């Protein structure tokens, strides 16, 4: 399984029908000059680092 | 000289006097507090500041009022507060601050009592918030 880690530099807001998912602007630990927006289920805050099984999949909002 | 400690409803009154390192809890030694797993909870305010560290004090506590765990927490707070008060009154303010700093950096309510008290039960259910099961059909 390919290795990639990232770190929330900004928490955008809640999304999902029930508000359970949160959108995070995440910056990859390697090659820190690039940011992708991801959907994370559990509680997150700033400078908190996530593991992404898939690296490049831009998360959109969840209607 | 006289201090106390409380967790929920148990109060533990500790007398710290001039003596030679004798630590009684209900007339028994502190080695016999006996929940058999929370004995280090009452050992902790001795192992924190200094393991023996004291041939000069005598601590006698008497605890009543709660349950086994509550009483253990009350006595563990009482003897810490007794050491702090004895050092404040007699030994020196520098050493009092020095041991207060360790107790508070390890604080498990060693010096400040836990302020959590039971919430009153309200009608329409058992417990403070739990309600009786509601049926519609």
């Amino acid at each position: 399984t390919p290795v990639t880690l990232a770190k929330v530099i900004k928490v955008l807001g809640r999304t999902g029908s029930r508000g359970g998912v949160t959108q995070v602007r995440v910056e990859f630990l390697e090659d820190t000059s690039r940011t992708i927006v991801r959907n994370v289920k559990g509680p997150v805050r700033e400078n908190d680092i996530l593991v992404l099984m898939e690296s490049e999949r831009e998360a959109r909002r969840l209607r | 000289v006289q201090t106390f400690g409380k967790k929920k409803s148990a109060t533990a009154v500790a007398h710290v006097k001039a003596g030679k390192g004798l630590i009684k809890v209900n007339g028994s030694p502190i080695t016999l507090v006996e929940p058999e797993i929370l004995r280090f909870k009452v050992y902790e305010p001795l192992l924190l500041v200094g393991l023996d560290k004291f041939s000069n004090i005598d601590i006698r506590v008497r605890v009543t009022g709660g349950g086994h765990v509550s009483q253990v927490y009350a006595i563990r707070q009482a003897i810490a507060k007794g050491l702090v008060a004895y050092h404040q009154k007699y030994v020196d303010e520098q050493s009092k601050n020095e041991l207060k700093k360790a107790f508070t950096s390890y604080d498990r309510t060693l010096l400040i009592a836990d302020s959590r008290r039971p919430e009153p039960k309200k009608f329409g259910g058992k417990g403070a918030r739990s309600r009786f099961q509601k049926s519609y059909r």
Binding site: - | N26, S28, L32, E34
Partner: protein, 143 residues
């Protein structure tokens, strides 16, 4: 070395005093042993037919040593537990009064416990003597 019953807490002292009452030879048993449950809230007799009366005696003697006078009703409340009332909720039930009274009378006969002027049974002089001897023996036996 200034050893009291309050120096060995709960199990070593009681097992050791029970063993001492066993080896003392005096049984003091009423013969009800092996038949009785020790509480109406119990479901079975004590698992060790021989020795449970001695353990009860040692427990009662230590209990009276640790405090002032104690009566049969206090002993029944102390030694009674919760009762399984079937599909009904549990409830505390007092233990058997006859066994507690007879064990109090046995300690009275052996001079471990005496009458209190205000009621109940109080540890006696030789009571404290033997209890403290057993405590010091247990302490030096097992640190």
């Amino acid at each position: 070395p200034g050893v009291s019953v309050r120096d060995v807490a709960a199990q070593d002292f009681i097992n050791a005093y029970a063993s001492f009452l066993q080896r003392q030879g005096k049984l003091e048993v009423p013969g009800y042993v092996d038949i009785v449950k020790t509480s109406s809230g119990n479901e079975m007799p004590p698992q060790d037919a021989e020795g449970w009366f001695y353990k009860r005696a040692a427990s009662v003697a230590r209990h009276i040593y640790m405090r002032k006078q104690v009566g049969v009703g206090k002993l029944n409340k102390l030694y009674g537990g919760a009762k399984s009332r079937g599909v009904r909720p549990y409830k505390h039930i007092d233990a058997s009064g006859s066994i507690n009274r007879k064990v109090l009378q046995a300690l009275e006969k052996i001079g471990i416990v005496e009458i209190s002027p205000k009621g109940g049974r109080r540890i006696s002089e030789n009571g404290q003597r033997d209890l403290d001897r057993i405590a010091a023996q247990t302490l030096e036996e097992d640190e």
